Structure formats: C-alpha cells, structure tokens
Amino acid sequence: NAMETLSVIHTVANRLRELNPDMDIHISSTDAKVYIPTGQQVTVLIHYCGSVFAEPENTDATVQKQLIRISATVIVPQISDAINALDRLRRSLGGIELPDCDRPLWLESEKYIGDAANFCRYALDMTASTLFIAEQ
Amino acid sequence: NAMETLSVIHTVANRLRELNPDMDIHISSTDAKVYIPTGQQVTVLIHYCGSVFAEPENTDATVQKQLIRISATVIVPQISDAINALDRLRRSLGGIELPDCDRPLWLESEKYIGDAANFCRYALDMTASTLFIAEQ
Amino acid sequence: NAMETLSVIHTVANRLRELNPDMDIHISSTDAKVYIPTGQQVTVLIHYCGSVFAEPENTDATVQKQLIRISATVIVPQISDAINALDRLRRSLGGIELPDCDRPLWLESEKYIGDAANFCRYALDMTASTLFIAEQ
Amino acid sequence: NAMETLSVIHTVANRLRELNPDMDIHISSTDAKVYIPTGQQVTVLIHYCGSVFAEPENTDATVQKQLIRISATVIVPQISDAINALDRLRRSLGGIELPDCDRPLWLESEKYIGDAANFCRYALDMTASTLFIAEQ
Amino acid sequence: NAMETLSVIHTVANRLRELNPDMDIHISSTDAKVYIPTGQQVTVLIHYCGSVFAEPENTDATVQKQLIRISATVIVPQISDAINALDRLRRSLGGIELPDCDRPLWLESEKYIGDAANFCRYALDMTASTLFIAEQ
Amino acid sequence: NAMETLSVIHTVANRLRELNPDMDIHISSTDAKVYIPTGQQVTVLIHYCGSVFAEPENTDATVQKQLIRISATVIVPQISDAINALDRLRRSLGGIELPDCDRPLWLESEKYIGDAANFCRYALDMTASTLFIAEQ
Numbered sequence: 001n002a003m004e005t006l007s008v009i010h011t012v013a014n015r016l017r018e019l020n021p022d023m024d025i026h027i028s029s030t031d032a033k034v035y036i037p038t039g040q041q042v043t044v045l046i047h048y049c050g051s052v053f054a055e056p057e058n059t060d061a062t063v064q065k066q067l068i069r070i071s072a073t074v075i076v077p078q079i080s081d082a083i084n085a086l087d088r089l090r091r092s093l094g095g096i097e098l099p100d101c102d103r104p105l106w107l108e109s110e111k112y113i114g115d116a117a118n119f120c121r122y123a124l125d126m127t128a129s130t131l132f133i134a135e136q
Numbered sequence: 137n138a139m140e141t142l143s144v145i146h147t148v149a150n151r152l153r154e155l156n157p158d159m160d161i162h163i164s165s166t167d168a169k170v171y172i173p174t175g176q177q178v179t180v181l182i183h184y185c186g187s188v189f190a191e192p193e194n195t196d197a198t199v200q201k202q203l204i205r206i207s208a209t210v211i212v213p214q215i216s217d218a219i220n221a222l223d224r225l226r227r228s229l230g231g232i233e234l235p236d237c238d239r240p241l242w243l244e245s246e247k248y249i250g251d252a253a254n255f256c257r258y259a260l261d262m263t264a265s266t267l268f269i270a271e272q
Numbered sequence: 273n274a275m276e277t278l279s280v281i282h283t284v285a286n287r288l289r290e291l292n293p294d295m296d297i298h299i300s301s302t303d304a305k306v307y308i309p310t311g312q313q314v315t316v317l318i319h320y321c322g323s324v325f326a327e328p329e330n331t332d333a334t335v336q337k338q339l340i341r342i343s344a345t346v347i348v349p350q351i352s353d354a355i356n357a358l359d360r361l362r363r364s365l366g367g368i369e370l371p372d373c374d375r376p377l378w379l380e381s382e383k384y385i386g387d388a389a390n391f392c393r394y395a396l397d398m399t400a401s402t403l404f405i406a407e408q
Numbered sequence: 409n410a411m412e413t414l415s416v417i418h419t420v421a422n423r424l425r426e427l428n429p430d431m432d433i434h435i436s437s438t439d440a441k442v443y444i445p446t447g448q449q450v451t452v453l454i455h456y457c458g459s460v461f462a463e464p465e466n467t468d469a470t471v472q473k474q475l476i477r478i479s480a481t482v483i484v485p486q487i488s489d490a491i492n493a494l495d496r497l498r499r500s501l502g503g504i505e506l507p508d509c510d511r512p513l514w515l516e517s518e519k520y521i522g523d524a525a526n527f528c529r530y531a532l533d534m535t536a537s538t539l540f541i542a543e544q
Numbered sequence: 545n546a547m548e549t550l551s552v553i554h555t556v557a558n559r560l561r562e563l564n565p566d567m568d569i570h571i572s573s574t575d576a577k578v579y580i581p582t583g584q585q586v587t588v589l590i591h592y593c594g595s596v597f598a599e600p601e602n603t604d605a606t607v608q609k610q611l612i613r614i615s616a617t618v619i620v621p622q623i624s625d626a627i628n629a630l631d632r633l634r635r636s637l638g639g640i641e642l643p644d645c646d647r648p649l650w651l652e653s654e655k656y657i658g659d660a661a662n663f664c665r666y667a668l669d670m671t672a673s674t675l676f677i678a679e680q
Numbered sequence: 681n682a683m684e685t686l687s688v689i690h691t692v693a694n695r696l697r698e699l700n701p702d703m704d705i706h707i708s709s710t711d712a713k714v715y716i717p718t719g720q721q722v723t724v725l726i727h728y729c730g731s732v733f734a735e736p737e738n739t740d741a742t743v744q745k746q747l748i749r750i751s752a753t754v755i756v757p758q759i760s761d762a763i764n765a766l767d768r769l770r771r772s773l774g775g776i777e778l779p780d781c782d783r784p785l786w787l788e789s790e791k792y793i794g795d796a797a798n799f800c801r802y803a804l805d806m807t808a809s810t811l812f813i814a815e816q
C-alpha cells in the first residue's frame with residue numbers, strides 16, 4: 001500500500017495522545033509560531049513540512065525515494081514547562097513505526113520558535129521515509 | 137518535433153482534470169502564495185517555473201539538455217483537505233508521459249507554502265526533461 | 273577585433289526582429305520587470321546583464337576569458353501567450369553566431385520575472401563567450 | 409538515565425551563580441537581544457537554542473547522537489564590563505561536567521549581539537553532547 | 545616600497561582621464577548606485593571596495609598577500625551609451641601597471657547596478673595585487 | 681596565563697595611539713557605522729567582533745583553539761583621508777604581538793562601511809589567536 005500523508009500525521013498525533021493523555025494535540029491550519037492554545041493543558045501542534053523526492057535510481061520504472069518532514073511544536077507559558085514537554089515528545093516519538101514507511105521515525109532537530117503572546121514555543125523536527133511508486 | 141512549453145503544462149492540467157473532476161484547475165498569473173480562490177471547490181494552480189539548460193557537450197552542434205520545472209499548488213481552507221489534495225496530485229501526475237520530453241514526469245518536492253487569507257497552500261514541484269536543438 | 277558588447281546585443285535584437293516581424297523589440301533603460309508596453313504587439317526587452325572575467329591563464333600576456341550574460345524578456349498580457357512567446361525566442365536565438373565571440377550563443381535559463389501592471393513577464397537568459405585582450 | 413534538558417540548563421545557571429555571586433543570572437522567555445535589566449549588576453540570560461540529531465549509524469536500533477546548543481548572554485551598560493564578564497563566563501563554564509552528557513561542556517563561539525536600550529550584549533554559545541536512545 | 549592604496553586609485557583615475565577626455569571621472573564619497581550628475585556627459589565614479597589578506601604562508605615573517613578590489617561605475621542617461629562606455633573602461637584599464645603592485649590590473653566582472661534618477665549604471669570590478677609586509 | 685580579551689583590545693588601541701598621536705582612538709559601544717565624531721581628528725573605533733573556538737583535538741582535556749576577531753574602523757569626512765588612515769592602521773597593526781596570544785596579529789580584510797552623516801568609513805578586520813584552557 002502507498003503511504004497516505006495524513007495517516008502518517010495522525011499516527012504521530014495519536015501516539016502522542018496515548019502516551020500523554022493530558023496534552024492537547026492538534027493538527028492545525030495555523031502556524032505554531034502564533035497559534036494560541038485554549039485549553040488548560042500543555043499544547044502540541046503537529047505539522048507536515050513537506051518532502052524531497054530523489055530521482056529514480058537508473059530504473060525503467062518511475063519509483064522515487066521520499067524523505068518526509070514533520071514537526072511537533074510545544075506551546076506553553078513557562079520556559080521550563082516547554083523544555084520538559086519537549087523531552088516528552090522525543091521520548092514518545094523517536095523510533096516509532098509509521099504506516100507504509102520503510103524505517104522508523106527519526107529525530108532531526110529541535111529549535112526555538114518564539115514566545116509570541118506569552119507562550120514559549122519549541123519545535124521537534126522529524127523525518128520519515130517511504131517509496132513513491134507511480135501508476136502504470 | 138521541438139517541445140512546446142504550453143503543450144506540456146496543458147498535458148499536466150488535463151491529466152489532473154480528468155482524474156480529479158471536483159477540482160478547479162487554473163493556469164494563472166497570480167502567485168499561488170497569495171491567490172484567493174473564488175468559490176468553495178478545491179483549487180489547484182499549475183505554474184511553469186522555468187528551465188535550466190546544460191551546456192552543449194563538446195560537440196559541433198548546439199544541442200542542450202533542458203530541465204523543466206513545473207509546480208502544482210493546492211489552495212484550500214482546511215489543512216487536512218490540503219494534504220489529501222496533495223496526495224491526489226501526486227498519484228495523478230507522477231511518472232506520466234509528456235509530449236516531446238525525454239523521460240516521464242518526475243516528482244521533485246512537496247512544500248508548505250503558507251496560510252495567506254486563511255487558505256492552506258501546498259505545492260508539488262515537478263520536473264520534465266527535453267533536448268533543445270538549435271536551428272542550422 | 274575586440275568584442276563590442278553593444279554589437280552583440282544588437283545581433284540578438286536584429287535576429288529577433290527578422291524572425292518575429294510582429295514583435296516589438298527594445299533595448300531599453302527600464303527594467304523588464306516594470307516596463308509597460310505602449311502597444312498591443314508582443315514585447316521583448318533585451319538587456320546586458322554583465323560579464324564575469326576569468327583570470328589570465330598565467331602567461332606573459334594579459335588575456336582573460338569573458339562570459340557575457342544577456343536576457344530577453346517577453347512582456348505580454350496573458351500567461352499562455354507569454355509562454356508561447358518564450359518558445360519563439362529560444363528557437364530564434366539558440367545557437368546563433370555572435371560577432372567577435374569564440375562560440376555560438378548558448379541558452380542558460382528561463383525564469384518567471386513577474387506580472388506587474390497586468391503584463392506577464394518571462395526571461396530567457398543566454399550566454400556568449402569571448403577573449404578579452406589587454407593593450408600593451 | 410536519559411538526559412533532562414532543563415537539568416543541563418540548571419547546571420550551567422547554578423555553576424554561574426556560585427562562581428559569580430555579583431551576577432544576576434536568568435533563564436528567561438525574553439530574547440537576550442531586547443531584555444532590559446532591572447538593576448545595576450551584570451545580567452546573564454541562559455537559553456536553550458536547540459539540538460541536532462545525527463542519523464542512527466547503520467544500526468537496527470534507533471540510537472541518535474545529539475548535539476545541544478546553549479547560550480549565555482551578558483547584558484551590561486558599558487562594553488569594557490561586558491567583555492570582562494564574557495571572560496568570566498568562559499572561565500566558569502568551559503570544560504564543565506554536565507548531567508547525563510557523554511563529554512564536558514564545550515565552547516563554540518562568542519558574538520556581539522547589539523546595544524539595545526543602551527546595554528552592550530555579547531553571547532557565549534556552547535555545546536553539550538548526549539546519546540538519544542529510542543524506547544523499543 | 546609599501547603600496548599606498550590612494551596611489552592605486554589615482555593611477556586608475558588618471559589613466560581613465562587620459563584615454564577618455566570626454567568622460568567625467570570622480571573619486572566620490574557618494575555611492576554610484578545613487579549619485580546624480582548634473583548634465584548628461586559620461587560620468588565615472590572610482591571607488592576602493594576593500595581588500596582580502598591571505599594568511600602568512602607559515603614562515604618566519606608576517607608577509608600577507610593582498611587582493612585589492614576597485615570599482616569603476618559608468619553613470620550615463622542612455623543604456624547604449626552606458627555599454628559603449630563600459631567597453632571603453634575595460635580597454636583603458638585591463639592590464640595596466642599599478643604602483644607597488646606585483647602584477648597588472650585584472651578585470652573581475654561587469655554588473656548592472658540600476659537606473660536611478662534616469663541614469664543607467666554599470667560597474668566594472670577589477671582586482672589588483674600586492675604584498676603586505678609587516679613592520680617590526 | 682589566560683588570555684584577557686579587553687587587554688588584547690587595549691594593546692591594539694595603545695599601539696595605535698603610540699604610532700598615530702593625531703588620531704582619536706576609541707573603544708565605543710556605538711557601531712562604527714553610525715558613530716558621529718566631534719572634532720577634526722581622524723577617529724578610529726576598535727571593536728571586539730567575537731571568537732570561534734575549535735573542538736578539543738582528540739584529547740581528554742578541554743583545550744580549545746580560539747580565533748579572535750577585532751575591527752578597527754576609520755571615520756573621516758574625506759574619502760582620500762580615510763584611505764590614507766586605513767594605510768596607517770594596517771602599517772601600525774599588522775604582525776604586532778598580543779598578550780597571551782600564540783602568534784602575531786594578522787590582517788584579515790578591509791571593507792568599505794558607508795558614508796553616514798557625511799563621514800567616510802572603512803574598517804580593517806584582524807585576527808588574533810590564542811589557546812583556551814579550561815579549569816580543572
């Protein structure tokens with residue numbers, strides 16, 4: 001089966017909800033740099049960053065290796081609470097299996113996003129890998 | 137026969153239409169980053185990004201390999217629909233035959249473009265290849 | 273004979289006018305990104321971008337390779353007419369002999385310039401080569 | 409025992425306080441480029457910049473090497489004093505042992521950050537190192 | 545004899561005046577991107593851009609190679625006259641001997657600067673080389 | 681003996697004052713790009729740009745090579761006076777010894793800065809090198 005990008009995104013979100021029942025996990029249309037959490041719990045936004053596709057490796061078939069980029073951004077008022085939450089995410093997400101992916105979820109980087117509206121924001125960037133197989 | 141750039145983008149556009157009838161496919165002058173869809177349907181803007189020409193290869197004839205960049209950008213309110221739509225562009229367009237091109241259409245990258253006017257925007261960037269042959 | 277830059281630009285313009293009698297061809301002081309055509313004919317602006325000089329090949333003579341960059345930008349109202357216009361330039365200019373240059377004209381790239389003042393703009397970037405020979 | 413990022417920041421801050429009792433050391437949600445100190449002392453803001461994770465090294469297990477970036481920014485009215493305090497930060501933090509890290513704290517770079525609100529600002533960027541080990 | 549930077553600039557300026565008596569040659573404090581001449585004669589602004597010094601060759605003496613950058617910008621109302629003038633500078637300056645320099649003046653690049661206040665502007669970038677020898 | 685950054689800045693300053701008594705030499709918190717001198721004397725601003733520390737060279741001792749960047753900026757009304765003063769800086773500063781540094785002062789580059797407030801500005805960028813040794 002081919003990968004459905006949204007399913008990969010939901011897998012990350014659901015694993016996070018299961019291991020962290022007291023976190024508000026969203027897949028939002030709003031950028032995490034500015035997003036305002038409404039709940040009384042630690043808030044994490046899941047975002048699909050994009051993909052880079054490698055050329056077909058000298059093959060008759062249009063088959064391409066795809067590297068998927070996904071971010072999870074913690075948004076909480078205190079700096080210390082944001083850093084603790086960040087440790088929870090990587091411990092929750094590093095190495096999990098993703099559907100229709102050819103290897104586990106890998107950690108790429110963590111970065112400070114900002115402090116807009118008095119919420120401290122830190123992002124964990126991750127990568128997944130899959131094979132795009134063109135219709136014939 | 138020499139490649140007609142407009143024919144290549146019409147092929148990409150026609151292919152998308154036949155496979156995705158509820159999509160509103162445009163070849164526009166406005167940048168997909170700021171374009172505001174009129175109406176409610178899923179919107180896709182097809183755009184010819186340009187070409188890079190390799191040097192002739194130590195020969196008497198002026199023959200140049202040409203790499204053609206084309207983008208298809210989804211523009212919709214909900215990000216879940218944007219991602220679903222991007223999956224549809226990808227299986228519709230990957231590996232298709234293009235008139236007077238050297239190889240099938242190849243996928244290059246997918247990227248989040250933005251959320252201007254509250255429309256989530258995702259672009260699928262693709263490449264075509266042809267051989268430019270100078271007149272003698 | 274030393275290469276006369278304006279003569280090279282003139283060769284491009286003339287060639288273009290002879291093969292495209294209904295195009296309005298200019299060597300203007302105004303940037304093609306902002307230029308607004310006075311008529312309804314397909315308009316092309318020809319421009320000298322600059323040169324890069326290679327350092328002398330370490331000989332008792334100060335002789336330097338020079339790579340001239342030249343743009344031709346089509347300025348037309350509809351996006352599809354712009355694309356068709358680019359095709360005409362490529363076919364017209366690719367591989368022509370330029371006066372006092374070491375080789376034919378080579379294509380370099382095609383890029384979307386923009387859509388200011390209701391005119392779609394595409395540029396064809398080209399290169400020419402000559403030997404700068406310093407005086408005694 | 410996996411690393412707790414906040415512990416690493418606390419260790420750097422505590423080390424600084426103990427060796428520099430006249431300094432005002434914070435772990436703030438405010439960027440050190442703009443922060444306006446409320447006092448006459450030497451103010452130092454500690455910040456967790458982020459991390460980069462190397463790929464697992466051809467191993468079945470998801471084990472990733474983590475490089476942690478941390479800054480300590482001095483904020484002092486006169487430059488002479490900012491430079492002196494910067495020297496003190498080096499001497500205090502360079503080569504120290506950090507909890508659950510696989511090597512001592514390393515210095516990376518120092519840079520002038522600005523003079524906002526008439527307080528000279530220099531940052532000391534440092535790196536810590538640890539091994540991220542995915543839960544199986 | 546140590547190189548006097550101003551003497552190099554003066555040599556370039558004087559050489560230009562002698563071979564081009566109708567040009568107006570200046571060494572100005574104003575950037576040639578914005579300078580506005582009164583009148584429509586060919587104006588040329590000479591400017592010392594800066595130098596790059598190579599590390600001493602790991603020998604017992606602090607001896608550093610110095611690559612000097614100098615620009616000559618033509619400021620002319622009509623584009624075709626700006627190009628003819630640019631050809632004139634290159635023929636006048638390419639290969640000339642400069643006081644206390646270890647080699648002739650070399651051309652580096654030609655670049656379109658802009659069309660501010662209705663004057664076309666092209667810069668000819670050139671390099672000179674000398675040997676900086678440290679005192680004791 | 682550990683390297684004291686302010687002391688290196690002072691040595692540069694003092695060396696300049698001894699060889700150039702009519703220059704007004706400062707260590708200021710104002711960026712030499714906008715600083716407005718009062719008086720007729722040639723003004724030079726000395727600034728500590730920052731440092732880069734190389735990793736400890738495969739040793740079990742935190743010892744790190746430090747490359748220090750320092751700028752000296754000439755601020756003078758006339759272009760020719762600024763250029764002459766730049767020559768005086770380079771002749772005064774190149775290759776002098778610095779306290780607790782492992783080699784002489786090296787010139788890196790010279791750059792034109794700007795002409796703000798009718799003062800022509802040029803900077804000489806230099807590097808010192810030292811060895812940072814961590815406390816046990």
Ligand SMILES: [Ca+2]
Pocket residue numbers: 021022023
């Ligand atoms: Ca819950």
Ligand SMILES: [Ca+2]
Pocket residue numbers: 056057058
């Ligand atoms: Ca291949």
Ligand SMILES: [Ca+2]
Pocket residue numbers: 157158159
């Ligand atoms: Ca339809």
Ligand SMILES: [Ca+2]
Pocket residue numbers: 293294295
């Ligand atoms: Ca005609």
Ligand SMILES: [Ca+2]
Pocket residue numbers: 429430431
């Ligand atoms: Ca205290």
Ligand SMILES: [Ca+2]
Pocket residue numbers: 562
């Ligand atoms: Ca003479």
Ligand SMILES: [Ca+2]
Pocket residue numbers: 565566567
């Ligand atoms: Ca005259």
Ligand SMILES: [Ca+2]
Pocket residue numbers: 698
């Ligand atoms: Ca002395």
Ligand SMILES: [Cl-]
Pocket residue numbers: 019020021022023
């Ligand atoms: Cl929880």
Ligand SMILES: [Cl-]
Pocket residue numbers: 155156157158159
């Ligand atoms: Cl559909």
Ligand SMILES: [Cl-]
Pocket residue numbers: 291292293294295
């Ligand atoms: Cl025509």
Ligand SMILES: [Cl-]
Pocket residue numbers: 427428429430431
């Ligand atoms: Cl203290």
Ligand SMILES: [Cl-]
Pocket residue numbers: 563564565566567
């Ligand atoms: Cl003349």
Ligand SMILES: [Cl-]
Pocket residue numbers: 699700701702703
């Ligand atoms: Cl003096």
